[PDB]
Design an enzyme around this catalytic site. Structure first.
Site, PDB file in Angstrom:
ATOM      1  CB  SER A  66     -19.077 -33.886  -6.433  1.00  0.00           C
ATOM      2  OG  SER A  66     -19.316 -35.467  -6.480  1.00  0.00           O
ATOM      3  CE1 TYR A 251     -19.655 -50.607   6.889  1.00  0.00           C
ATOM      4  CE2 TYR A 251     -21.510 -49.736   6.061  1.00  0.00           C
ATOM      5  CZ  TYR A 251     -20.431 -49.796   6.095  1.00  0.00           C
ATOM      6  OH  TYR A 251     -19.360 -48.788   5.482  1.00  0.00           O
ATOM      7  CB  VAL A 290     -23.726 -38.516   7.972  1.00  0.00           C
ATOM      8  CG1 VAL A 290     -22.631 -38.016   9.175  1.00  0.00           C
ATOM      9  CG2 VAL A 290     -22.917 -39.385   6.643  1.00  0.00           C
TER      10      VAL A 290
END
Ligand SMILES: NC(=O)C1=CN([C@@H]2O[C@H](COP(=O)(O)OP(=O)(O)OC[C@H]3O[C@@H](n4cnc5c(N)ncnc54)[C@H](O)[C@@H]3O)[C@@H](O)[C@H]2O)C=CC1
Ligand SMILES: NC(=O)C1=CN([C@@H]2O[C@H](COP(=O)(O)OP(=O)(O)OC[C@H]3O[C@@H](n4cnc5c(N)ncnc54)[C@H](O)[C@@H]3O)[C@@H](O)[C@H]2O)C=CC1
Ligand code: NA
Ligand code: NA
Lengths: 415, 415
Positions: A66, A251, A290
């Site tokens: 979605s 990360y 992003v």
């Protein structure tokens, strides 16, 4: 009750509202139906302009369909390859006075545009981690498609209820072993904030792996295989991020990294299952950082993205989800010469790991403490792209106009 | 229920809303709390800048006190004369998701500003036509003020329930005897609309007189006198419009005109009552045509006002309610040399009946059918002033910001 009450119709404004961005930290509590629609259309038009992708899949399951990368994959397969797409996701439907989440309006737009082009679109709404949702998906596939030939795994979530036990897991976005001295960007007051991030516990690590590791991915592929809904020679991929040194402590070599590393182990067994079933394949695909709801929550990412954008923009290599994923499909999932790294992953993120980009971003990092942030970074671009996710700041959309937040989706299984 | 639901506070936006003008014909279905407040403050500052008015009243009842001329009178007496003011009006209180009417927010602002200056402000909300509301008013006066020395009568309403019988009356804004060929302005599509207005029935006339005539005014003065709450040598006035020839068929010599003529008869008997009680007085005061909810409903008025504004603006004599009423008080209700016409009315509207203004407006009238309306008229100014009534288009107000529509008023009797 006033001297002139009821003498006049109230009109549709009683059921409609004015939706403006309402942002706190990296969470936006509203979403604009019309802007989300324009967003989907924008990505579709990008794909349609680049043109059809040859040797693509024909019947595709997207898990996490979605928003963000999963949405970009759904659009690439459908509008770039003409594929049938079954989407799975977890979103809040809109109702009167209560705008639904971005993913809901994105998906409503998807079904709308897909029908226009005569493409199959059906969606399943609920907890992808659950056995229940798995069974509904299998059912739709059996009824409508026979089998799927590609499975895209693209979930980003802070938590997971284990299907077999009942345990719930919360992920932690923290360093490992050595505590990290975190620079960064308070996106609210727009000032550089120095912070100290404690490392994570063993359990904090094992949970984060539970949520964002690859166990559920394997559960999905396994579930599909014995119900017999995975076509021979099928292909599955799961998305990951590696980044370069500057993001490594938080990360790659942090809690979330640990989970993404689990992906790399699970993929071997999954690849095994598929190669046996008519010579299919399984890959981890690496994408560029992003702006997304998911990534915007990671400590350091807003400033990192703000700097990344500035630098890639001047090199002329800045892009977002649809560009990344269209090229993943074109060059790697469907191409003759696929980009494969040493660990055997597929790669779309190289423009980001460009040593020129990384060196630039790095010396700009320490240099940041500007409170003249608008000069060294593209913090403006970041904010702009963050608002975009929720359907705000889109050209051609009249934000002053009433909009009905109650938008329904046909062929949407509510689980 | 979404993958990230409840992890974050929703905040005050859940109780607040974005209020934008929503206009149909001459009715606006929304009102802005902050803009209405700024409006009241603007009128107060006008009065305070002009400076105190000598020989003013000290304890004042305003009937119709929340908007337009009645509001301007309340502000003039309180901030121009230091008077105590009891306001009567009929407005819809705001609640969550449901903005109240303009008069409600205007009046809330009034009470706020009045308290700041140490002035008495109390208000009564309900049907001024009813015996019940009359009794509550008398009660407040007895308790708080002893007596009032000025009564301003300023109601504008489409209907009236008769206090003694139960009959309800609807007013008609129609010509008399000879049907009128109506030019005019469709304010929606913004084009000249030619129309034919049938005259009115006898009953249509007798009703309009029932609602906007002077029976209730006399009932009020009579009610005040035998409860003993009207001070000796008190003064009462009721507002009217005469206009000049161009408005005569529709207004003065029309249904509404008939009612305003009834005012002229009733005032004689009322004046009689007051002269007997310590030499008080009663006058009809004539005011200039202004944009109001009431006037904007009268056929021909939007185009007439649009032209009037254009012309008075270039003569430098354009003004609104507060200017009109401040000068009514200064020059006529409280001055040494009052402007009295032949029928013995007080006059504030002369700048409008200026033969130069009227001749100009008249030859512009027939000339109108422009659909180049923006050149010959100040239709822009009209729209702007109409939006102003409801708290829109005010400088310094951030219309994009959430506002709480639930605004309460202290010392407000709800009848
Ligand atoms: N955003 C970024 O910088 C990058 C993210 N990635 C990866 O790509 C994948 C997708 O991430 P994003 O596009 O950022 O995330 P996103 O926040 O935009 O999308 C997450 C999707 O998963 C769905 N979802 C979340 N929880 C679910 C649940 N419990 N059940 C069913 N569906 C659920 C959401 O509804 C949405 O469709 C992730 O594996 C992420 O790690 C990889 C490269 C960089
Ligand atoms: N607006 C114009 O061009 C002019 C109007 N006038 C007169 O001035 C007077 C006031 O008119 P506007 O300022 O235009 O009206 P308005 O529409 O702005 O104000 C009417 C006031 O009366 C109150 N009210 C209405 N019905 C009520 C009821 N049933 N019970 C209690 N209060 C009620 C309203 O709440 C409001 O306070 C009227 O007599 C009108 O004829 C005179 C000159 C021109
Ligand atoms: Na996704
Ligand atoms: Na009034």
């Amino acid at each position: 009750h006033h001297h002139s009450s009821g003498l006049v119709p109230r009109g549709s404004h009683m059921l409609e509202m004015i939706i403006k961005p309402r942002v706190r930290g990296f969470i936006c509590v509203t979403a604009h139906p019309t802007g989300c629609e324009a967003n989907v259309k924008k990505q579709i038009d990008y794909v349609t302009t680049e043109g059809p992708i040859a040797n693509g899949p024909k019947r595709v399951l997207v898990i996490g369909a979605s928003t963000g990368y999963g949405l970009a994959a759904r659009i690439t397969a459908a509008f770039g390859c003409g594929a049938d797409t079954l989407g799975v996701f977890f979103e809040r439907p809109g109702e009167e006075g209560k705008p639904g989440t971005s993913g809901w309006y994105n998906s409503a737009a998807f079904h709308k545009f897909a029908a226009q082009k005569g493409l199959y679109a059906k969606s399943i709404n609920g907890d992808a981690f659950s056995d229940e949702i798995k069974q509904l998906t299998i059912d739709a596939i059996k009824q409508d498609l026979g089998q799927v030939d590609q499975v895209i795994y693209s979930l980003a979530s802070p938590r997971r209820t284990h299907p077999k036990t009942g345990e719930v897991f919360n992920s932690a976005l923290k360093p490992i072993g050595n505590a990290v001295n975190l620079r960064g960007l308070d996106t609210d007051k727009e000032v550089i904030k120095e912070s100290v991030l404690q490392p994570a516990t063993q359990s904090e690590i094992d949970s984060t792996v539970a949520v964002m590791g690859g166990e559920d991915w394997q559960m999905w592929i396994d579930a599909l295989l014995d119900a017999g809904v995975l076509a021979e020679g099928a292909q599955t991929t799961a998305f990951t991020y590696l980044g370069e040194k500057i993001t490594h402590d938080i990360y790659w070599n942090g809690s979330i990294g640990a989970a993404k590393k689990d992906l790399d182990q699970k993929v071997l067994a999954i690849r095994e299952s598929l190669a046996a079933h008519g010579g299919g394949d399984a890959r981890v695909s690496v994408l560029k950082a992003v702006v997304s709801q998911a990534s915007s929550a990671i400590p350091m990412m807003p400033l990192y993205l703000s700097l990344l954008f500035k630098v890639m923009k001047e090199k002329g290599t800045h892009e977002g989800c649809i560009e990344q994923v269209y090229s993943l499909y074109k060059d790697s999932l469907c191409g003759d010469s696929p980009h494969m790294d040493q660990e055997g992953r597929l790669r779309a993120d190289y423009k980001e790991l460009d040593p020129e980009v990384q060196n630039q971003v790095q010396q700009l990092w320490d240099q940041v403490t500007n409170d003249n942030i608008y000069q060294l970074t593209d913090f403006v671009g970041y904010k702009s792209e963050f608002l975009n996710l929720f359907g705000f700041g889109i050209d051609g959309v009249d934000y002053d106009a009433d909009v009905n937040p109650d938008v329904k989706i046909p062929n949407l299984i509510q689980g």
